[model samples]
Structure formats: structure tokens, C-alpha cells
Target: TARSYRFPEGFLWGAATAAYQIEGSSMADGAGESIWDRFSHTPGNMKDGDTGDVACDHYNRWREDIELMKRLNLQAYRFSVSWSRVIPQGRGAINPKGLAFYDRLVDGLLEAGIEPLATLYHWDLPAALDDRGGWLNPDIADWFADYGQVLFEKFKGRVKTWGTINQPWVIVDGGYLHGALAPGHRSAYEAVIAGHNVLRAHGAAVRRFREVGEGQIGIVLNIEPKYPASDKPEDEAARRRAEAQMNRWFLDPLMGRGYPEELTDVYGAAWREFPKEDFELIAEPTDWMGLNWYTRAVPENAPDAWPTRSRPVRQTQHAHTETGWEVYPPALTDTLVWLSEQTGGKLPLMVTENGSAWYDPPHAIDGRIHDPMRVHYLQTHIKALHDAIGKGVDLRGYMAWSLLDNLEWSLGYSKRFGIVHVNFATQERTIKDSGLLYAEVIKTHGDVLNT
Candidate 1:
């Protein structure tokens, strides 16, 4: 075994969840429909025909969930607020009932002594906004800022740490480029516009935070470190394309580095010359950054590889998770180091989301859910993060992928990424073995990772 790996004294340990993924009752209490609501309701959109009509029932189970957080020794909880829930129409009117839901949830977390970290948008735009061109339209930036203004004012003191957007790349790539996620549409041109607007919108939200809120705010980017499968020049080019398209696509522009040159190669004709003034807003200074890292990609050049012209070469030698992600922890460390370098050590960073989905039973067995793989992944990744911090990365905090097993977007409820297993049939929550191990890790300040 390796030597003991301890987290810094002030390093926070917690779990994360999205509003659409965990909060069921999509249209309850004047809550307007989100893109996810419309997407999942359509036939053949979600896997297993699943919808988040009653996911974890967190919309109605906040008190219990907060208690669960306390039991897990959590210092914080990172969660997203439903845009449609608070602003039913996306811009014009406010939904008091919907805002009250988050108000209660935030107060409850603080009452339990857990800091509440909030994400403004997590790929769940109001369906009304989508109808008006969604991320494709330039004006959505203002719409997003107005939506953010409401939350900033309401949760100013209670919610100090805020994430403007969850993942712009996912919102644009999945929704516009691949058509696998919400607001499903496939067009390189739309992807280009949508992606830019998403970043612009994050800029707008942070701008709103500056005008209305007192707390620190930043954007969350999911970075998948890219590795070349071969030393060939073509393979290296493909790797660069893949890296720029996914990892640096948002990060570069967010950190004041403008768009990557490889992007022009990836999008080709679809790429547009964005206004330099827009980048000024997009590069708004922030107090921190959130990184949602899960795994890395080993890509090889391929003729059939779409825009990037590269496809991930599955590492069969390593174990793959239920999500088909190769089990690799070193990549996390490498990415963090790279991020620190890219940002020039100017800001503190947080691992906002990191966890694996393993084969979990539909329900608990003997009042417990034994998830050995998830437990191993958690312990391993935390240790990897400690290594990153030891290497001088400004790593401030880490939040596990999820707090409860809930809907997994278009993949539906098939994958379980939660430390706490949820029984969809009975709506009962069972803390898994991984959850218990996490408690020990938090209790002893990461000492459990060594054992």
C-alpha cells in the first residue's frame, strides 16, 4: 500500500446532484417545463422510456436528504437549481412556489451545517427558451442572466459559492451536435452557435452575479484529458482536435485565452469569428472554477471520425465502468495540473463532480447496497486529488458525482452513480458501502483513503 494521503484541513468533502436528475415533479407548483421534461416525455427519447417524474422525490424530500448529508459527514453539497422551476417562463415572470422549494432546501442545508453550492444551469433550459431558439439564439444570454439574477438575490447569503453553468460543451455537443440529449438537434453550425451562446450565457450569469450577489461565482467545465493512441502525426493532430473540441472548448475562452485554433479544424466551415467584445464578457474574472472530471480519452486517427476525425480507442486492458469510461485515476491528477498551468495559478479550483456508475441492484439487499467498485473509485480518486494538491495545484474542494441514484438523462435510470442507492419502487434511500467509506474519509480527514 502507498503512504497515507491526507486532504488539506479546509478541503471540503461532499456530493453533487442536478435538479433535473434528482428533483422529480417536473411541472409541480407552477414549475414550467424544462427541455429535459419535454425530451424525456417524447417517445424513444429516454432509455427504458424513463422520465424524471418522481426521481428521488427530492423536490418533496429535502429535509430527509439534508439529514442524510449530515450523516455522511458532508461539509458541503453541490446542486443545481432548476431554471424553469424559479422562472417558469425563463424570463418574464417568477414562480414563487418554485422559488420557495429552493429556499427551503438551502435553509435546510445550512441548518444541518452543510454549505450549499449552487449551479445555475445544468443542461435543463426552460422549454419555452428552446422554442425561441434555445442556445442557438444570441438573446438567450440575456434570458439566462435574468434567470440568474433571481437566484443571486434570493440566495445571496445562504448560498455563497455559485457555478454559472454546469458544462457548456455537454449542453452544446449533446444537444446540438449529437442529438442524444435534450433539445435534440444535430448540426455542426448549430453546435458552433449553441456552444458560443452557452459560454456567452455563462458570462452573462456571472455578470449578473456581479450586479446582484455578494458571493463568489464561477463556471464549471468538464475536462476529459486527451491522450494520443499512437505517435503518428495524424494521431497527434486528432488528439489536438479532440482536446480542443471538448476539454479546452470552454476552458480556453473562459480563462481569457480565446478559442483554440484546433476548433477551426474541427468545425471547419461552421466556425464563426466571434466578436472580441464578447470575449471580454466571457472572460469575466471569477473567484473559483469547478471541474467535473471522470476519465480520459485515448483517441486515434480515423477516417470515419466525424468533425474531430478521432475516435477513442477503448482501453480493454483496464476496467470500464457501467458508463463505458475506462478506470483511470492518474488522468485526473494530470488534468488538474494542466488546469492550474492554464489558469496561471490565478484561481482556486474545485472538483465539482467525480464518481463512477457501477452495477447496482434495483433495490437494496439486506438493508444495504454493497458497491465495491464505487467505493474503490472514490478512495482512489480522492487520493489522486490529494496528490494533485501536493503538487501545488490550487485544488480547494471535491464533490462526489451524486448524492442519490436517480435518472441518468437520456440513458435513463440504467446507470447508478450515487453513493446512496435509491429504490425507485419504494422511494427508499439506502446509504451504500461507498457512502460509509466516504463518511470515514471525511471523519478522519482523508485518513481512510490510506487504509
Candidate 2:
């Protein structure tokens, strides 16, 4: 008999997608310009000049997409709202049309018996917000809170689960420190300030949710667990710096532990001590936490390396994704168990985003996108999640990284991370074998993982 790895009862099974990645009519329906709009339009920012101007067209075909969710037997759907769409300029005036889109989308999900897990912000900052210093400005805390209020008031009962922000680390590290993402800026000082303000904003939003929202609210953090490349003391030190900068910097403060001491060394003179009161807000209690696990990093000391002064030693022994992420299933289990311990086994966890990118044929052959690698990645990861659960982690659910192949940020549309293949030219969605297998997992409560 095959081994059965059944998930706990009421465990949610779903796939996720972001607004800017799938919704094409970004500027339509009274939507304002987002940082992504400006960034992608600028030459050399995006590869092959690809943009989200007409992504998966989910903005127009959302109803059809909801039907796809029902067909996939999704217990839930995790998605992000474009801040530029809901409150156009990021705050103040409300966009009824923008709210209507989400209203319909939420109603459709509820009608289809799928729970709606909505993320308030996902990297696409309103261009207007960036003009006024974006996350760097301390005022963004109130601005973000006001935006969260709008959604809570509008979709209070319809949307039960709310994520204040998705991957705040990426928003600050990539957008501010590295200048690789939208509203790009490259300053270590700016990165520290921006990251602090991001947490302040998260606290503000969660505080507001406690006031007006009825259901669960939390934040989504993307983590790549760090391991030392070598057993040497230097490599261990480098690993500590890498972990502090990437994982502990934001997580520590959010968990009421304050910034890691190593961040001072990592950021050098740029890391200024924040106000004591700010820590109170940054550590606002959350009902749950979302973990977006992708890969693990083995850090090796690099004296000349900027910022962290450590570089990832790629594992050539394992398969790497298009994004160059090592396919390490054990890391997911390890990280999940670690996260449970970090939260004192009190906070419920969710795999908010987990998927990989692999090159697939441009079009489906014989009405199918044959992606054996993605199928394997999904299965192994799911099993790894089950392993974590068996070890007594409070994991509540899993939302695959994406529902459809869509825009992949600065790298553009080339990296396919979706189980459902989307033909950009025709806006067609073909459920890959992985997606079908996911449906079976949902139907069987993960009993299919054994087979």
C-alpha cells in the first residue's frame, strides 16, 4: 500500500496570482498609474521590453477566471489588489469602479464556494505615492492604513482573510537597496528607512483591521533560509549576515524582537535605530502569518560584496528553476518547522506562495502544456509541507505561487511559474497536469500525494 499523507481537515488548497501580473486593464476603470507601469515603460528596465499593459487580461475576464477556479476544485484563491486601482493615487479618493471589480471578484469566489484570501499590496505602489517618497516617507503608514480601511469596509464579510502586505522584504530590498524592482532606488540608507516604514505600515494596517475587519488578518513574508557554504568560521559569519539582512531584519521586528544586531554591520552607518514606539506598532499582533517559500541559499563570505558581503553558492547538484532557484523540497519543511518555532507554535501559518518557473513550449501541444518538472516540483513541495505538518507545525493551507503564467517582474514574462499555462497572445488558459494533480490533492485532502 502507498503511504498516505493527508492534510488536516479544513485545510485550504488554492493557487494565487497578483493584480499587475494578471489584470491587464491596469489604467482602465479609473485606475491610476502604478510604479510598475512607469518602471516597465522605461527602456531597459524590463527584458525584451515586456510589460503588464496586457497581461493575462484578468481584469476583463475575471469572471471566467473564477470559473476556472471552480473547475480546479480550489478551496480558496489568494490574490492581490492593485493599490493604484482601488484608491488610484494610493489614498484619499475612492475608485468605485476599482472597488466594483473586486466586489464582483469576491462575490464570484464566494459564489463558487472558494474562500477569498486578499493581499492589500503587492509591489505595485501607486506612482503618486512614489512621487511623495513612497515607502521611504514615514507618512506611508497612515496612507497604507487608510487604503486597508477601504477594503475592510467594502468587502468585510466577503473577503475573510486579509494580508496587509506581501513580501515587505522584497519591496524594500529589491526596490530600494538593489533598484531591481519598481520605483527603483539604490541607497543603503533608503533601504533601511524604506524597510522600517514598510513595517510601520504593516502595523498600521493590522491595527486598522482589528478595528474594522471581522476575520483573520496578517502579513506575507518571503524567506529563503540561509545555510553556510562551508563549515569555516568566515562562512558561518557570512551566513549570519546574509540571514540577518534577508530574513531576520524584517521578521525580528515584526515578532517584537527588534532588528537583528548583525543588520548594523550589514547596513554599516546607514542602519539607524528607530523610535521605541515604532517597535510597538511594528509588532502589532497578527492572527496568522503567510510564508512564501521558494528556495534556500548557502552563503559564502565575499569580502568585496556590497551590502551583505555574502554571495549564494548555487547548488549545481540539484535542478534549478528559470529564476535560478534550487529545487530543494527539504528547505520548505525545514523553514516551516523553524517558522512554527519562531512564533512559539502559536501563530497559524499558510504557504501563501510556492511555485517554480520552467521554460515550456510557447503553445500547448495537443491541448496540453507538458511540464513534468512543474508537476514534480508541486508534488514534492506539497509532500514536504505535509512532512512539516506531521512534525506538528500549525500550517493552515497552501496557495500555489500563481494560478496562471503571467508577468514575472523585472525578468518579464519569460519565466513561467504557473500550473495553468496562459497563452499571452490569445489570453487562453490551459490547466497543466500539475494543476489537475492539485485538484486531486484538494479532492483527496492530499491523499493523492502518496500516489
Candidate 3:
């Protein structure tokens, strides 16, 4: 009576993680300070005074972590490279030990029969670069490309899949506009400039990847499909603004559509006209696109909300995560379809990050971590992805948001998004029931998701 959902053959099954969130040792072994290194140290910047000083200690325990992935039957591992770690000053100097660490990491992943998907930037900008205008300066585009050249040269044949930037919208929206992320600055004008520069940097990196890399390269974006709160004209208009700012603002430009006209209205005078040539660079051809989707947005008109003048109307009827994100599997299906249509169904897609956090215990009781909500989330979303694939979307892979419970950015370590549970005190990893289910899903090519 129920439909069966199965992934395509050779679909990549993996887990995703960021450098700063999981790899503690922010300044160890000649690694320079990142914006996170400074932001988290500032009082009131991080929740509960928590920082990534000793996050999962992944930097020191990478070998064991890779073993965990092999045990989970992961075909790939999507991890980020800290710009500060590889190039201490962000540019002009190379850290031999930094490359040594990743050399071992990539070689180790390959030894375990796991493909490596490396994201160039994951919101942790080198602190020195921040001192030099960072994303606000146009030169950051060249600086980022130079950093890409270093990695491409080091891990040419081994690391084939590359992601230029994790999520430009979050870097600008959280770091510049809201001051919720590292190198925090709360100015609308600065946010616009930073956002533009992020795109330029993304294009620059892709261009560099073309020159020195032998494999595919792309950019990852966090897309949230927006729905109107009601049929009212104001509510519809609010939804359009929400979609434009959150979804289209970055993606449209990357797809050669230029900045959404709605952004000019949303940012008002804070928005500035950009050179036409810049869009040409931002629209550089990418081999694939990674969609890091978690939830959808339902917007309502908010006259008091600056800039966008719209606020999210939380959906109470649906289930929510510890981060207050509603669990709406249908939205994932809609988003993939929309992306396929927007890109003319040509660009290959990967679910780079998709998982939810819950109130997980530090350690499993009775030798098991029973997280039914997370299991349900994984099952439903994977099914949603399968639905899109059946409808002609060029979906290639799905990487779970995280493999271990680690830092949750400025929200601190309060949220647990991993299918694998980590005991911070002991650094012990216990595969949650959801993770076990994920293993089965991969083993069965996603037939387990239907069950």
C-alpha cells in the first residue's frame, strides 16, 4: 500500500562537517586565528560561553573519525578546509604542518575507500584577512583564488570534488548584517558589500579550480523555500521579499540572472549598483551545485523589521527542531524541483547538508541513543529527495548534515545535529539509531528509507 523510495545507482552517501565546528585546536600547529577564534573569545558573542577550543577534537582524532565513517558505510565525506589552518595569514605564506595534516586526512580518506568533498571556505575567515577588510574588499576575490590554487596543487589527483564556498548568504547575513556569526558587524551597507564580494570570491575560486584541478568543482548554498502566511497581498509581498533575500539574492546572480530586483527595494539605499563584469565572473560555469537545505520559511509582512521589512511566521502546526526550525519534508521536494527548473535541469545537484538537532543525551543509555525524531527526519527527507529525482531532477548525492555532535556555531554546543553522538568529556562516539538506519539506507541504496 505504500510507495518504495530508492536512490539511483552510484548515489553518494556521506556526512558533512565544518572545520571550526568539529576540528578543535583553533590555533594549534602554526594554524593562524580564524574570525571564529576571535568572535567566540569575545564575551557575549557565543552562547553559554562555549567555543570550539576543543570541539570534537577531530583535528587530533581524524584517523579514528575516518574509521567511524568507514564503519557507517559512508561512500564519501564532505568536510571543510580552514583557510586560516592552511594559510596562516590567509595568503602569502604557507604552513607546512597545515598541509601535512590535510595530506594525512585526504590520504586516510582514500585508504578507507571514501571520496573526499572539500569545501574551501566554511565561514571561518583568517583573522588577519579580517583585519585587512576581508570580504568587504574586492581583493578578497583574488586572495581566495590564490588560496584555492594552493589546495589544488597539493591534492590534485586525490581530492577531485571541490566546493568553492559553503554558503555566501550565511556569511554575509549572519556575520555582517545580524552580527550572529564571526567577525560580527551589524550594518546593512556592509552586508551588501560582503555579499557581493563573497560571490566574486566564489567565481574566482571556481576559475582557479578550472586551471589547476582535474575534477569537478562547485558552490554550496543554503536555500529555504518561502511560503506566504496567507493569500493577503501584503503577506504574498512579504514572502517574495523573503525569497528574494534568502534564496534568489545569491543563487540568481550565480546562475547569470544578476541580483534580484527585489533586493534593491529590500535594502533601499544600502544597496549599490555593481559592475556588469562582476556578474559575468560570478556566473562562472560550475560542475555541480550543493544545496544545504534544512527548513523552509513562511513569511509575513513586518513593518518594523529593517531591510527586508518581513519576518518569518513560524509554523506551529509542524514539528520543530532544537534550533526552532520546523520539520517540513515537503519543502525539500519543492526546493529541488524549483532548483532543477531554475537551472534548466542541467546542473547536477547534491544535498550537501541536511539534518536536524534534538535534545540528545551526552551518552547513550542502555548502550543506545534512541533518537526517533532524527530518524524520522532522515527517512522523510531522503524520501523527499527521491521524489525530486523521480521528477527529472539531476540529483546525484545526499550527505547528512553531520556525523558527530559538535559545535553549533554561536548557538554554541547546545544543539545536537549529528546522527553520531559524541561524549565531549571522553570524546567517545556512539552511532545513534538514526545513524545505524542511515547505514542501512546506504547499504540498500535508500530502500531502507521506505521501510
Candidate 4:
């Protein structure tokens, strides 16, 4: 007798996207400019000087995109809102058109029998707020909460699931530490302050949600499991530091534990002690957690690698994606089990962002885009998630990284993570082979995974 590795009933499958990556009409209808607008336009900031100036044209054609979601048979659509779009100055007056856009998006998702998983922030901080110290300012906590109130009150019961922030680690490390993302600043001291304030902002937002929002709320974090590059104790120590710096930096404080001790050693003089009260607020109880997993890393001590002083030792044995992420499905299972334990194994968990970019032709050939690598990547990762459930992980749902081939941040459109092939010039979209396979997996509920 043959058996299928079937996922439990009610396992949601959908796609995710962020405002700065998709919604382009950017400054239209009283919508204020986000930091990305300033960051991308600066000389040498974006690839080929590309900006979100007209990314995927999602803002103007959101209704048509809803039809595409229906075609994919998506159960949910996880999307983030532009903070500047909602509140022009980040806290003062509201943008009625901005609210109406999201209101329409949520209602359309419901009308199409699809669930809406709304994210409050995805690193597109309002440029107005940036002038006021942005995430580095302690006052951002109140500003973010005020912004959240606008959506929580408007969406109300229409959007049941909510994510407060997407990948706090990336927001701080990329924007503050490395100067790679928006509002770029290369300062360790600034990164420390920004990281703390981001958590505080999350807590403040969740607190506001409890007061007015309906349905469950949580925060999305990116977790990459770390392994030792060799049997040497130095390598093991490097792995520990890497994990503590990247994985536990924000998670520990949010879960009631203070910042990891390795942080002091990692940041050296840049790290300063924050008040104990901040930890209490940061520990604000959340209904669930979102883990955005892609691949695992093996760390080895390297002095040149700043801060942590540890670098990822490449695993040449495994195949890499267009984004150069190693294909490791088992790491997905490992991270899930570890996250369950971190959340006391009670809080529901979701794979809020999981997908890979792959090379494809500039346009669809014969009305279809064939991307077998992405298909395998999705298949293995989905099966690994089911394996996690078999091992007693309370895995709830999965939202693929993206639904459309939109902006790729600093890399611009050089890399595409979407299962849908998008022609940038004409704004045409074609479902790839992986997308077709995903619709079948959702239709059969993982019976196809075994086959």
C-alpha cells in the first residue's frame, strides 16, 4: 500500500508582496513618498538606476491582479501597506484614497473567497518619518502605533490575519548597518538604536491592535539556521555568534528574554544597554509567529567579517538559486521545530515568506514560462513543512514570497522570486510551471507532493 504525505486540513497556501516592491503610483492622490523614493533615485543607489517608479503597475491594476489570484486558487494573499500612503506625514492627517485602496483590496480578496493577511510595515518607512530620525528615534513606537490604528480601524473584521512587521533583522541590518537598503546609513551605533526601536514599534503596534483590531496578529521574522563549518570549536563559536546575531537579535527580546549576551561581544563598543521596561513592552503577547525561511548557513570565524566577525562558508555541494540561496529543504523543517520550541510550542506558526528566484526568458514563450528549479524548490520546501508537522510542529499556513515579479529592492528587477513571469515593459504576467504545480498542490492538498 502506498501513502501520501498529506497536509492537515485548512492549511492555507498563498503568496506575499510588499508595497514598495509593487504599488507604484507612489505619490499619487495625496500619498506621501516613502524612503525608497529617496533611496532609489540617489545616484548609484539602484541597479541601472531602476526604481519602483512603475513597478508591476500594481497600484493601478490591483483589481486585475485579484483575478490572477483567483486563477492561482490562492487561499490567502499576504500584502504590506505603504506607511506613507496611509498617513502622509506618518502620524498627522490620513490619506482617504490610500485607505480606500486597501479597503478595496481586502474586499476584493473576500469577494473572491480568498483570505487577506495584511502586514502593517515592510521597511518602506515614510520619508517624512526618516527626516525625524526614522527607526532610530524612540518616538517611532508611538508613530507606528498611530499608523497601525488607521488600518486596524478601517479593515476591522474584513482582514482577519495581521502581521505587524516583516523581517526586523533585515530592516536594521540592511538599512542601518550595511547601507544596502533604503534610508541607507552605515553606522553600528545607529543599527543598535534602530534595532531596539523597531521592536518597540512592533510592541506598540500590537498593543494598539488589541485595543481596536479583530482577528489574530503577529510579526514576521526571517530565520536562517546556522551550522558549524567544521569540527573546530572556533567554527562552532562562529556558528553560535551568527545565530545569536541574526536569529535571536530581535526574537529574544520579543519573547520576553532580553538581548542575547553575544550581542555585547558582537557589537563591541557600539552596543549600549537599553532599559528593562523596553523588554517588557517588547514581550507584548502575540497570537502567532511568522517564519520566513530560505536556506541554512555554515559559519566560520573570519576577522574581515565585521560585527559578528563570522562569514558563511559556502556549501558548494548543493545547488544554488538565482539569488544564490542554497537549496536545503531539511533546514526548513529544522527551523520550524526550533521556532516552535522558541514560542513555547503553543503559538501557531506560518511560513509567511518562502520562495526562490530563478533565471527565465525575458518573456513567456508559447504562452508559458517554464522554471523547473523553482518548481523543485517549492516542492521540496512544501514537503519539508509537512515533515515539520509530522514532528509535532504547529505549522499553520504557508505564503509564497511573492505573487508578481515586482521590484527586487537594491538589485531592482535583476532577480525575480515570483512564480509568475512579469514582462516589465508591457506589464504582462504569465504563470510559470511552478505556479501551475502549486495550484495543483493546493487543489489536491499535498497528495501531489507524494506523487
Which candidate achieves the best lDDT against the true structure?
Answer: 3
Runs in model 3 lying further than 4 Å from the true structure: none
Candidate 4 TM-score, true structure as reference? 0.99
Instruction: Give per-residue CA lDDT, model 1, range 342-431, as digits (tens).
Output: 999879999999999999999899999999999889988998998899889999899998899989999989999999999999989999
lDDT tens readout by residue for model 2, 315-430: 99999999999999999999999999988899999999999999987788899988889999999999999999989999999999889999999998999998889988788889
Q: What is the TM-score of each candidate against the true structure?
A: 0.99, 0.99, 0.99, 0.99
Q: Each prediction's Cα lDDT score?
A: 0.91, 0.92, 0.93, 0.91
Candidate 3: residue pairs that collide: none
User: Candidate 2, which ten residues in sequence have the lowest lDDT sum?
Assistant: 1-10
What are the runs in model 1 whose C-alpha is more than 4 Å off?
A: none
Cα TM-score of candidate 1: 0.99
Candidate 3 lDDT, tens digit per residue, 1-451?
A: 5889877887899999999999998878999999999999999988899999999999999988998898899999999999998899998889989888999999999999999999999999999999999999999999999999999999999999999999889999999998889889999999999999999999999888888888999999999999879988998988899899999999999999989999988999899999999999999999999999999989999988987889888798999999999999999999999999988789999999999999988777877899999999999999999989988999999999899999999998899999899988889898999999999999999877665
Q: Give the local distance difference test score of model 4.
A: 0.91
Per-residue error (Å), model 1, residue 208? 1.6
Candidate 2 wrong stretches, greater than 4 Å: none
Alpha-carbon shift of residue 67 in model 3 (angstroms): 1.3
